[PDB]
Amino acid sequence: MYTFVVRDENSSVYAEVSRLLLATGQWKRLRKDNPRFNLMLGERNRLPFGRLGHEPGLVQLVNYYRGADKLCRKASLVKLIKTSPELSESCTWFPESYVIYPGNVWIAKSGILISSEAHVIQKYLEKPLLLEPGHRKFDIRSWVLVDHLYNIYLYREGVLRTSSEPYNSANFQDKTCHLTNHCIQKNYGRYEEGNEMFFEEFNQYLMDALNTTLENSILLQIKHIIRSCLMCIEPAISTKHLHYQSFQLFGFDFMVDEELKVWLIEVNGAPACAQKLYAELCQGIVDVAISSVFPLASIFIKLHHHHHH
Amino acid sequence: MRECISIHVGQAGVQIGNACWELYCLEHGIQPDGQMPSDKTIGGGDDSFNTFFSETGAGKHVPRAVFVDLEPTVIDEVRTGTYRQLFHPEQLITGKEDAANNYARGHYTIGKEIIDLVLDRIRKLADQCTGLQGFLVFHSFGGGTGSGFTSLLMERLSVDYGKKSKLEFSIYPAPQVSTAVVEPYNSILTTHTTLEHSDCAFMVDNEAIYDICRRNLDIERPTYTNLNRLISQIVSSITASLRFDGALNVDLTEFQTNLVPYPRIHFPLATYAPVISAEKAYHEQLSVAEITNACFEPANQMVKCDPRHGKYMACCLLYRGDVVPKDVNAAIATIKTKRSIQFVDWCPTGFKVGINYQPPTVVPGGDLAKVQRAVCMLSNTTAIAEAWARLDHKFDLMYAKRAFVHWYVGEGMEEGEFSEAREDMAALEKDYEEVGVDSV
């Protein structure tokens, strides 16, 4: 038997991972304070990394990368982009942003305020791509898994989180048409179920309306961005040759403008998943991240590129 | 006697030729008009410098050399430049249209139209020799002419002069100054076709020379002129034993015996020291020990590789200038007690040493300091196979897609020549692996 412990009660993803492992027959769950575990499903806050890897005869694995918070906070992300030469202040795919301690339309964030007067201040994208019918804004969520060997796996199913309100240049106080979060929307549901559109439909739409595909017009840029971000921090967080090992699931959020240019908005370090895909994605984590280290008795695209120059 | 004939092929070969002959003129006191006032035997002689220069009755000292290119602009610069009077016009041979970076045009389509004239001019030089020793051939791997025409020429020379020795000086490609995507194709094609026709080949990696010029001469962006002047210093170190006399001088052919254990294993690694600027040479006299030490620093090698992760099969030291054996022996003893020098078990570990007393020379207005003493090491090490690996990988990436191959097929080549050459390179890498294993 392999042995594991669960320490974050609110993870949907890992509640399903846990139930799958148990139903394998070959994993036993332990109480949260037993140190004799192979695998820790850790808490989000102050996970005790300094206590891992000191148990003779147990290979120990955890589902978080220490240091990844640098990518997953707004101020840290702005600082990492501006100060890292592989990204640079002139990075073309991230909006102009400025750290502030306590077409000139800006957004302030970390309750959100968008104005052209007046935390991070970020350039607000005034010319978004608008879906027809409804003349409406959206954002793209992608899920990405990084294994103990630092392979980068892009889950093949994404999701568009849409607005169901027409976009209004002349009202930035009213946030229902400008902010595409799932909670804030629940005209919810009119066009699609739960304001969620999946890749098959969106690809069909891009073919019929704009005579192109999702792969060519959008996905190349997404893959470029994800790979560039994670290759930037690899030296700081890799656990190769370390006494314990890590994997982690990340959530990348993107904006698409009216010329089919992709912009990074946010990296989320503890994402949830769209309902319909829990079953498949969680099974993929078990296959790729856990059994690879602890073998028992593809839905991902591996991102790798070694250009010579 | 014992004369040597030099052949300079394509742009890189020609321009390196210019640097070498200028330096030889300075070392021997020959003026640009060909006069040599110190030579009191008019119209002939068997002095050591006569291995490389013949003499006319009018006192002119004439290089034993042919320059060949398929277009005229580089050799036209020789025809109009400073040393235009050194060479007889029949020694400078040009066509009208080049090989456009394509091995197939240099070996077949264009090369076939000029090969007989080149061979006849070479024959004219050979007939003036009373005991011809062999040939020195200068060329790039990457150009269409330097690759393909050189291949053709080597094949014809084996026919016309039998087993007569042939040595190469070969320019290995680097991306920092490279100009063609297809250079890996040309490099494998010529290496395959020449392998049986060459007795010994000295490879010079443009990336190593570029690095050394930047790091040691403080040149921000080195030109071909900088690189060729340094290359010429290494060539001069190698041929100095043929061109000067002396009691501690050691013949290069005698080194070849030691450098080549099997016919295919004939690619020595060269290392030269000191390369230093005038501003840094001031008040800093470099001893025999300092330069001998610098010969085991990988940053001074002519080819990028790591001898610390291979095995030695031979190791030779060629000193010139103010150098006596006692200091050589003390330096060698120290190096043996301090460094990672592992020989194969079928070969003795003694270092072979030569000393020539004539001091090093530099060209006026150059970036090199004049120094009192210098050294060139020649080692036969398995680590040099790393350079083949790098080239083979680039070859594979393109060939799997057949990228650019249509340019070669359109001039009459077949794909079978690509795969036959690539297999021969695979077997060479395997040979270099086999020679480093221990006996049983």
Binding site: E86, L87, S88, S90, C91, T92, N211, T212, N216, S217, L220, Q221, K223, H224, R227, S228, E259, L260, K261, H304, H305, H306, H307, H308, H309 | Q11, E71, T73, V74, K96, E97, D98, A100, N101, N102, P175, Q176, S178, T179, A180, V181, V182, P184, E220, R221, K394, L397, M398, A400, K401, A403, F404, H406, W407
Partner: protein, 420 residues
């Protein structure tokens, strides 16, 4: 050594004339053909494009062709119109009325032999002809159909010489003439087989540049042609001035064309400074002369040309930086696929400039656009009688459509290929 230049039809002749004006100015050649420059660098490779006549007169090695007479008059009255050889003007009377079949099979066939006589006389006296460049549009009748006829006949007589075109692709934003997608598909069908190199100069992109970036509310032909002439000057700079590099058209082609059919290039120009700014701008979609996003595909090969006095160290560092930060857009199986040239002599009115030449699979977006308009008419057979009345079959239209769809599919195949 020598290049022979040909210009066919209205568009071809207008941009040809602008090209000759700009380069004559760069070499210090006045309208009479006399040299009055200040620097020996102007004449050292002058013979590439100019003949020497008696009196040290320099005469363009240029042939001027149209089925419509009067463009000859407008050229002859243009500022440099006296510089051209009078016997090199070959013009008919009829016109082609925007009908490719007239250019390729009927009116143009009658005149092509007289065009070839002038070509042959110019070629016979070249020390070592490297090849030919043709300027034309693909949307009219004369340049498209008769120009591709000329290409085929030249290949018959000079099969071992290089054939290069600068080909202006149609857009509804500049011409409303409804049959243009037929003429462009029929010409492209020829070009895939018989040229070594084609610069796609797209009137869509030129219009959008003049309108958005240069702020010209009603762009004229003069504004489009200013951009075209600056691009063409840029791309012939490396052959025209003495300078580190020893090349001919064949070696350039050998460096740029990995597969014989995929020889359609995307040009760019910047600015419309510092080396980082030039470098960033030349790789921006908004600076391309073909309406394509290079981030929707991958680069097979790229050439970058910088003009003006600047640090070569800095140019090298910036080219490496762009490759490192944009690595996903370059195919991994062609190592060292980006080439750089620097010319000391700037263009007129600028201290620093950059010209871009890209072989990108994103060019499929251009071919897709044209293809859509083609199908919209062919499915209703609209205006087809214009062509069948000249002897053509429907079958030739079917084949041309099929070949352009194949070209698209091939670009997609090499975009998706990997190394492992």
């Amino acid at each position: 050594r020598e290049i022979v230049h040909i210009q066919a039809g209205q568009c071809g002749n207008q941009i040809g004339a602008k090209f000759w004006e700009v380069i004559s100015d760069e070499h210090g050649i006045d309208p009479t053909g006399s040299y009055h420059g200040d620097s020996d660098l102007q004449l050292e490779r002058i013979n590439v494009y100019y003949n020497e006549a008696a009196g040290n007169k320099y005469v363009p090695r240029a042939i001027l062709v149209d089925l419509e007479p009067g463009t000859m008059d407008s050229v002859r009255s243009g500022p440099f119109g006296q510089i051209f050889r009078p016997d090199n003007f070959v013009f008919g009377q009829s016109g082609a009325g925007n009908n490719w079949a007239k250019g390729h099979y009927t009116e143009g066939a009658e005149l092509v032999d007289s065009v070839l006589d002038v070509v042959r006389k110019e070629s016979e006296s070249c020390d070592c002809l490297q090849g030919f460049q043709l300027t034309h549009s693909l949307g009219g009748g004369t340049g498209s159909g008769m120009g591709t006829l000329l290409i085929s006949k030249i290949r018959e007589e000079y099969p071992d010489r290089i054939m290069n075109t600068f080909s202006v692709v149609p857009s509804p934003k500049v011409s409303d003439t409804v049959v243009e997608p037929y003429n462009a598909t029929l010409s492209v069908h020829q070009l895939v087989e018989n040229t070594d190199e084609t610069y796609c100069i797209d009137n869509e992109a030129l219009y959008d540049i003049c309108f958005r970036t240069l702020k010209l509310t009603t762009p004229t032909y003069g504004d489009l042609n200013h951009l075209v002439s600056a691009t063409m000057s840029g791309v012939t700079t490396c052959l025209r001035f003495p300078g580190q590099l020893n090349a001919d058209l064949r070696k350039l082609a050998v460096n740029m064309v990995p597969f014989p059919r995929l020889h359609f290039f995307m040009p760019g120009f910047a600015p419309l400074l510092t080396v980082p700014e030039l470098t960033q701008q030349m790789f921006d979609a908004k600076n391309m002369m073909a309406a394509c996003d290079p981030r929707h595909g991958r680069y097979l090969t790229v050439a970058a040309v910088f003009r003006g006095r600047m640090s070569m160290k800095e140019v090298d560092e910036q080219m490496l930086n762009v490759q490192n930060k944009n690595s996903s857009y370059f195919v991994e199986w062609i190592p060292n696929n980006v080439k750089t040239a620097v010319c000391d002599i700037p263009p007129r009115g600028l201290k620093m400039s950059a010209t871009f030449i890209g072989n990108s699979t994103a060019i499929q977006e251009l071919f897709k656009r044209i293809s859509e308009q083609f199908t919209a008419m062919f499915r209703r057979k609209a205006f087809l009688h214009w062509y069948t009345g000249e002897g053509m079959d429907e079958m030739e239209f079917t084949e041309a459509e099929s070949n352009m769809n194949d070209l698209v599919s091939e670009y997609q195949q090499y975009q998706d290929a990997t190394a492992d």
